[PDB]
Amino acid sequence: HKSEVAHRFKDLGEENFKALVLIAFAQYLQQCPFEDHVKLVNEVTEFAKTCVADESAENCDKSLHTLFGDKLCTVATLRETYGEMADCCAKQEPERNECFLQHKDDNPNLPRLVRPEVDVMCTAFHDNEETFLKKYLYEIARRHPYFYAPELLFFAKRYKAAFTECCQAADKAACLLPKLDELRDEGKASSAKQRLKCASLQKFGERAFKAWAVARLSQRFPKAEFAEVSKLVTDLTKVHTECCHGDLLECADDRADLAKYICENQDSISSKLKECCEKPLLEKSHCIAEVENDEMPADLPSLAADFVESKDVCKNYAEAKDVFLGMFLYEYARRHPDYSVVLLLRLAKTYETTLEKCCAAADPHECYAKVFDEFKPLVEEPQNLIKQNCELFEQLGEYKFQNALLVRYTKKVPQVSTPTLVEVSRNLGKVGSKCCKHPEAKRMPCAEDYLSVVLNQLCVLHEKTPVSDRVTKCCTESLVNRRPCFSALEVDETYVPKEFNAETFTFHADICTLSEKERQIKKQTALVELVKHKPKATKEQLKAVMDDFAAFVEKCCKADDKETCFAEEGKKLVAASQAAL
Ligand SMILES: CCCCCCCCCCCCCC(=O)O
Ligand SMILES: CCCCCCCCCCCCCC(=O)O
Ligand SMILES: CCCCCCCCCCCCCC(=O)O
Ligand SMILES: CCCCCCCCCCCCCC(=O)O
Ligand SMILES: CCCCCCCCCCCCCC(=O)O
Ligand SMILES: CCCCCCCCCCCCCC(=O)O
């Protein structure tokens, strides 16, 4: 209406408004202390309240962009602290708003956020919950200036619920620590996924994004007509292009408009939206993004008629190649919620290659009549990989599955540093836990969602400090080919075994005292180094050295003496292992 700030305060409600304002300033003024942000917030909040009381009071008709910038240019130390950013204050809107956007700092050189002790946290939570919660909201927002503000707020609400539940339990730490591990891991994943999609959009362009979305949205909304999916993809692409440009309010507005459009047209989109569409503005787009797949239409034909049989395949294709290809994707994806989106794209791309050849030929129908046979192998390759890995997981359990992976990936790419091997194998292991639990029909999507980030973090680590041609080869492939390429890496037979180091395989009795998580990391570090030193060792030779170690550890950790048993028996295990391998 007349006052943007007032309209945002009425839609969001006071609590949400204050938190979002905190996150928004935090992400720009990343070196200002917490107490200075409490001050901005209270100042922006009292102003907003005067506009609620009276839409036409002084300054209430300014744009939110204008007010945000004005507030930013009001910080006294802005030049001293942020430098270039203060020169934005000399510009007029809209140039000013675009100048602020260029001058966020992505790596503010801030010490990492240490998780205090449980009783320290729960005491702070009891004494000043709002301070505890917003001080940490500030610390996270300042460290992740591109984390979509409303999503960060959603996380904060889950942290609050976990403190609320767990700080009253019998065993506080056993309740809370798993929840914070889970929240940290989801927050880190959500953050890398937001960054990867914007990098993808720029790298692979808008067509590939649109392909990706058609497939994802047809799986979610299989009852929708194609033209509806297509409308939603066009808008989704807009949203995501604006969101990647980094202006939070424009992003939020475009997301809200789309959410509104979907809710006003549920009957044309999906039967699963009722609940999301009843929620308030703030939660609506987020709830829509998480909704489960609608049940597909009861009795659907095979895609044979429209895409192989029908005489107007080549004619329908040449007329609008991407509409046609998109229709194929839609039809394939709606009947296959059980595939990864990239599988579906491999498929679509196979059908594209095939129409480009076959529509150029004398009898098109006969050239391409067997195109669906070429999909069988593509579909089976990830299905088999899921079978093999989830069966191997069941008989081994998370920890020893990771170890199976260590051995396997270290023999594949032994040039990779031991810490990157450990972390990536530990992580792949967790993707095996999370996703081999799901029923068959959600396994491949799950694994996709999670491998995409585990693999992109492996690549970014590695392209910022490189070691293996192959790894680079797979990381600079198409994003459809990324995972298959990694899967095809073979044991490196041109690797020169790493020279023995005494210390690497020396263990002191502190390891009997380390936490579960840390003792595994120490063991897994040694396993990697063991495989680096003797790459030729077989699975049974390695199991003999590993089961020898398993009996070395526990038969010096319950003993009348400790660090002697580790010094003296640890000479015996090492020389016996060197001889055996
Ligand atoms: C966006 C969340 C705002 C509130 C977070 C409150 C709890 C902070 C817990 C301590 C830091 C956690 C780091 C970690 O989980 O490893
Ligand atoms: C004075 C500065 C105010 C900054 C407040 C930021 C408000 C973000 C609005 C988010 C609304 C949710 C829309 C959505 O993501 O669907
Ligand atoms: C009006 C166009 C809106 C977007 C929906 C139809 C076109 C989407 C692109 C589909 C092409 C991808 C095929 C492929 O390369 O695998
Ligand atoms: C070693 C980690 C095992 C994780 C669970 C199995 C996942 C197998 C790969 C399937 C990935 C689907 C993405 C794709 O289609 O390329
Ligand atoms: C340094 C670690 C590089 C190796 C990690 C590649 C894992 C990606 C594929 C995971 C699922 C398939 C298992 C496989 O075939 O290897
Ligand atoms: C060349 C000296 C080799 C000495 C023995 C090193 C063994 C290190 C890896 C042990 C990991 C065992 C994991 C387990 O099954 O508990």
Side-chain angles (χ1 to χ4, degrees), residues 474-581:
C474 298
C475 293
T476 58
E477 289 267 57
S478 37
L479 212 73
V480 92
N481 291 359
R482 172 166 290 191
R483 197 284 313 160
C485 182
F486 274 110
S487 294
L489 297 170
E490 288 184 71
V491 172
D492 196 0
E493 303 293 31
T494 79
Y495 173 73
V496 198
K498 204 200 195 177
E499 64 210 325
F500 179 79
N501 184 278
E503 176 51 47
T504 304
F505 306 101
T506 316
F507 306 84
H508 317 80
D510 74 82
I511 68 94
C512 310
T513 236
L514 284 164
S515 78
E516 177 69 343
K517 168 163 165 167
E518 302 162 296
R519 178 168 50 266
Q520 293 171 16
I521 286 173
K522 232 293 92 225
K523 281 147 91 203
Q524 281 169 335
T525 300
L527 184 48
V528 170
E529 292 287 345
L530 178 50
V531 180
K532 268 152 156 182
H533 176 54
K534 290 284 168 200
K536 305 300 198 186
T538 51
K539 268 294 203 310
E540 47 258 300
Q541 285 178 303
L542 241 29
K543 195 137 70 82
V545 175
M546 278 191 271
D547 269 309
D548 277 3
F549 184 89
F552 164 61
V553 171
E554 76 87 59
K555 214 201 186 229
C556 297
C557 292
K558 222 300 98 74
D560 285 288
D561 194 5
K562 281 188 156 48
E563 70 258 299
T564 303
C565 188
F566 280 98
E568 306 307 323
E569 289 268 58
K571 242 189 263 54
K572 264 180 85 195
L573 180 52
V574 170
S577 290
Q578 278 165 109
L581 312 164

Side-chain angles (χ1 to χ4, degrees), residues 164-361:
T164 288
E165 173 163 41
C166 297
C167 295
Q168 298 198 326
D171 201 358
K172 288 180 171 84
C175 183
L176 189 55
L177 264 32
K179 277 158 197 280
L180 302 168
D181 287 349
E182 175 162 299
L183 272 31
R184 193 212 23 238
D185 289 354
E186 290 178 11
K188 286 210 299 159
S190 160
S191 168
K193 189 146 59 213
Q194 298 169 51
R195 281 82 171 161
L196 171 156
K197 288 190 200 140
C198 290
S200 298
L201 189 67
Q202 203 285 332
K203 210 175 286 143
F204 301 101
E206 197 167 271
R207 189 178 176 251
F209 179 87
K210 280 184 187 197
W212 185 85
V214 172
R216 188 57 249 199
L217 296 188
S218 309
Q219 298 173 307
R220 279 182 123 70
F221 307 145
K223 287 191 188 95
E225 269 168 34
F226 169 73
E228 198 56 38
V229 172
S230 187
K231 197 209 165 268
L232 297 164
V233 175
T234 293
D235 295 0
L236 195 54
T237 301
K238 211 257 176 203
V239 169
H240 201 252
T241 298
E242 184 69 51
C243 296
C244 295
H245 178 255
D247 187 313
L248 167 58
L249 290 177
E250 292 312 330
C251 176
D253 290 357
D254 289 353
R255 288 171 55 89
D257 290 354
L258 188 46
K260 285 176 177 65
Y261 172 94
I262 288 161
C263 294
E264 272 166 12
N265 291 277
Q266 289 180 234
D267 58 306
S268 299
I269 297 171
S270 166
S271 52
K272 305 294 184 170
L273 300 173
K274 183 199 199 299
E275 275 220 23
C276 290
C277 289
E278 286 168 335
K279 298 219 194 180
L281 176 94
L282 180 54
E283 305 172 31
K284 211 176 272 190
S285 67
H286 174 98
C287 184
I288 294 167
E290 312 232 278
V291 73
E292 96 253 42
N293 298 333
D294 204 353
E295 263 87 24
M296 62 181 83
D299 250 301
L300 287 172
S302 94
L303 293 81
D306 298 354
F307 301 97
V308 201
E309 254 56 87
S310 165
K311 296 173 179 180
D312 300 327
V313 160
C314 284
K315 182 180 143 302
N316 288 175
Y317 174 64
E319 193 160 312
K321 289 181 183 184
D322 293 351
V323 161
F324 203 65
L325 290 170
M327 287 165 157
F328 178 83
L329 254 187
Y330 158 78
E331 296 292 357
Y332 219 119
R334 62 200 297 214
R335 328 167 136 76
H336 284 293
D338 68 319
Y339 297 181
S340 60
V341 174
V342 296
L343 176 50
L344 281 156
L345 296 169
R346 275 171 217 131
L347 298 186
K349 182 155 169 44
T350 290
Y351 185 67
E352 180 187 46
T353 290
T354 277
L355 295 190
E356 289 291 301
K357 168 164 162 185
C358 295
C359 288

Side-chain angles (χ1 to χ4, degrees), residues 385 389 408-409 412-413 416 421 424 428 455 458 486-487:
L385 283 180
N389 284 286
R408 177 206 293 172
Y409 298 131
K412 287 154 154 323
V413 283
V416 175
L421 279 160
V424 174
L428 267 355
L455 260 25
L458 163 62
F486 274 110
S487 294

